[PDB]
Design a binder for this molecule. Structure first.
Ligand SMILES: NC(=O)c1ccc[n+]([C@@H]2O[C@H](COP(=O)([O-])OP(=O)(O)OC[C@H]3O[C@@H](n4cnc5c(N)ncnc54)[C@H](OP(=O)(O)O)[C@@H]3O)[C@@H](O)[C@H]2O)c1
Ligand SMILES: NC(=O)c1ccc[n+]([C@@H]2O[C@H](COP(=O)([O-])OP(=O)(O)OC[C@H]3O[C@@H](n4cnc5c(N)ncnc54)[C@H](OP(=O)(O)O)[C@@H]3O)[C@@H](O)[C@H]2O)c1
Ligand SMILES: C[C@]12CC[C@H]3[C@@H](CCC4=CC(=O)CC[C@@]43C)[C@@H]1CC[C@H]2O
Ligand SMILES: C[C@]12CC[C@H]3[C@@H](CCC4=CC(=O)CC[C@@]43C)[C@@H]1CC[C@H]2O
Lengths: 319, 319
């Protein structure tokens, strides 16, 4: 497998397929896209409880195992516990519910979606009369202890985090009695926001940086500035694509793989799912990698703006 | 394909089996060892016209292709033109001779063995009455042009160099009319001689550093100081071997792979040839890599001392 090794010994495919879909897409769409992705050669699938696509994704995977296309052990499935279940006593219950939806006995990786707790309840986005999210206070170190228990319970093989800044990672890494270090930190990363600093930090701690937004994000309404520039329309990517006889998307994907990053990607088009697998066919020169490094402009497509004000908002700029 | 991509688009397996043997071993020994390597999963084999083992190595490979074990396209074979054939008009004749000994239509890689020419002739080590090598002077840029022609003739898929220092690589890289940059520079590299500087330079130029002496070299008589320390006896390697439940050799091999180096290795023992393939099974922590970086002590096992007076002796410069 085009895999890299996690700090707990487990292997993870460097190219994963994201199962989050635009609000304008029917949930069931996730099932068909997953089947196409599997046939295209994808083994790593990224999901979350908040995506409401887990049951459909699980159906596609179980279907592909049933007909002998792949085995459960060959699939790397990731889930994430949402802000409303960060309370230590609610973490495992959330994972068990996901497993129930998937018809799985275990997930390969389980992440804390955001380092920001929200009022517990069925509603994923509890708000008051002003439409403001209802924040809740939770000890993330305790949340982590609960994640470790899930690993020891065999409900998940590995555990990690998502959307954590290095300061928050250090808190966990320096935790008294720490048992398992996060194996990864899934964050937004692309030429407009190359996370060089956070990447170097993660590498120094044996933490894998898993990137989303590698192609500019699906630009979800209510989460991304619709007036922000479209990443793949960047002239530099267009020019480099022609130089290497590839596509702007392939240039953006290869850029990250060559930096030691595990990449996620999503496309609603079958032709593009297959195309993205071609990222393993070519190499970007060291000089062109520097050119791409020059596109950095601190453009964060998903700032989780509705979370601003929360004591743990992870995206404050560096000094 | 546990492989990396060369600057000419071709793929090379990151772990290769070397076929040079101590003078105390019969040449035919290479046939047996190559077959064992192939059965253990090795697809990359390193040889040279000066090793006097090409015909035996070729026979093992052809034998394994014949009985259905492996395909030629799945094998990556490297040869090297010796000092006595650096004259531009003799480079191709040497490659053609190697192909004849191998009964191959092409080699995957062809290297200039040393940036030092010796008096042309059948004798690989021409000497005078004082037992000193008879040096010759050649236009290495002209030698390179001849290598480029060999690539354009399809006799070799890629071309590179071996034992070249920074200035000598520049000599080729800045050559007016240069058509193909060297895809690699095969040099000695291990914790006692980590080549930090030369490695950084090669990466900046898209040149892969291929390392020999990864396990301390076979300590050839007449080439290696028999009183020099044995690399695999290094305490740090022993302690790390115990920590990871591996072996000193596996630690030394993995150290190089994680630095982006293509590693060669040779063993006369079947058990060790099989063992070395296990290098893909574990990961050294970032902190432990730094510990290994600390062992550098400028210990060059193969200084090519009999060539020390040659105008182009490569080991005088800092790197
Ligand atoms: N942990 C988190 O906070 C978080 C947040 C957001 C997303 N994610 C994860 O990341 C995954 C990816 O989502 P994303 O929003 O980051 O998007 P993305 O992977 O950056 O993709 C952005 C856009 O690229 C287009 N695209 C894909 N392949 C292409 C190709 N070969 N040529 C041209 N265009 C191509 C897609 O359009 P088409 O569909 O039209 O092809 C898509 O809208 C999700 O499914 C999820 O698993 C995680
Ligand atoms: N281009 C050049 O100038 C140049 C120069 C020298 C060599 N090379 C290339 O590099 C290849 C490697 O040769 P090298 O001299 O550098 O040696 P090496 O790979 O550094 O190996 C040195 C020693 O390691 C031992 N060893 C191997 N695997 C082991 C294991 N699992 N446990 C314990 N010991 C182990 C071997 O002893 P045992 O046999 O007793 O196991 C061998 O004598 C050559 O065959 C050749 O292809 C190139
Ligand atoms: C932006 C992000 C992915 C897209 C989703 C969002 C939560 C609400 C949503 C509900 C949907 O039916 C479609 C996707 C999405 C818009 C997620 C919050 C964290 C991040 O993973
Ligand atoms: C040291 C090196 C590999 C070992 C050989 C040496 C040339 C003479 C030799 C002749 C032999 O019959 C056995 C190997 C070796 C001792 C090579 C010169 C460059 C390097 O590849």
């Amino acid at each position: 497998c085009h895999c890299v090794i996690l700090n707990d010994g487990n292997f993870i495919p460097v190219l994963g397929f994201g199962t989050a879909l635009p609000l304008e897409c029917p949930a069931s769409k996730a099932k068909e896209l997953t089947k196409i992705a599997i046939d295209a050669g994808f083994h790593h699938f990224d999901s979350a409880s908040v995506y409401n696509t887990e049951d459909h994704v699980g159906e596609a995977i179980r279907s592909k195992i049933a007909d002998g296309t792949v085995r459960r052990e060959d699939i790397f499935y990731t889930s994430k516990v949402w802000c409303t279940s960060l309370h230590p006593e609610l973490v495992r219950a959330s994972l068990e519910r996901s497993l129930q939806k998937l018809q799985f006995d275990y997930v390969d990786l389980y992440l804390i979606h955001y380092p920001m707790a929200l009022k517990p309840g069925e509603e994923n986005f509890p708000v008051d009369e002003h439409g403001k999210l209802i924040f809740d206070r939770v000890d993330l170190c305790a949340t982590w202890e609960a994640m470790e228990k899930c690993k020891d319970a065999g409900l998940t093989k590995s555990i990690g985090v998502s959307n954590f800044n290095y300061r928050q990672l250090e808190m966990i890494l320096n935790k008294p009695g720490l048992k398992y270090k996060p194996v990864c930190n899934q964050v937004e990363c692309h030429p407009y926001l190359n996370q060089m600093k956070l990447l170097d930090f993660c590498k120094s701690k044996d933490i894998v940086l898993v990137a989303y937004g590698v192609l500019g994000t699906q630009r979800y309404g209510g989460w991304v500035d619709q007036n922000s520039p479209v990443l793949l329309d960047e002239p530099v990517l267009g020019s480099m694509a022609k130089k290497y006889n590839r596509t702007p998307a392939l240039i953006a994907l290869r850029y990250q793989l060559q930096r030691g990053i595990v990449v996620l990607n999503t496309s609603l088009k079958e032709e593009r799912i297959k195309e993205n697998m071609q990222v393993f066919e070519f190499q970007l020169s060291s000089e062109d990698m520097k050119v791409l490094d020059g596109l950095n402009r601190n453009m964060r497509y998903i700032p989780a703006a509705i979370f601003k004000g929360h004591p743990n908002w992870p995206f404050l700029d560096e000094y």
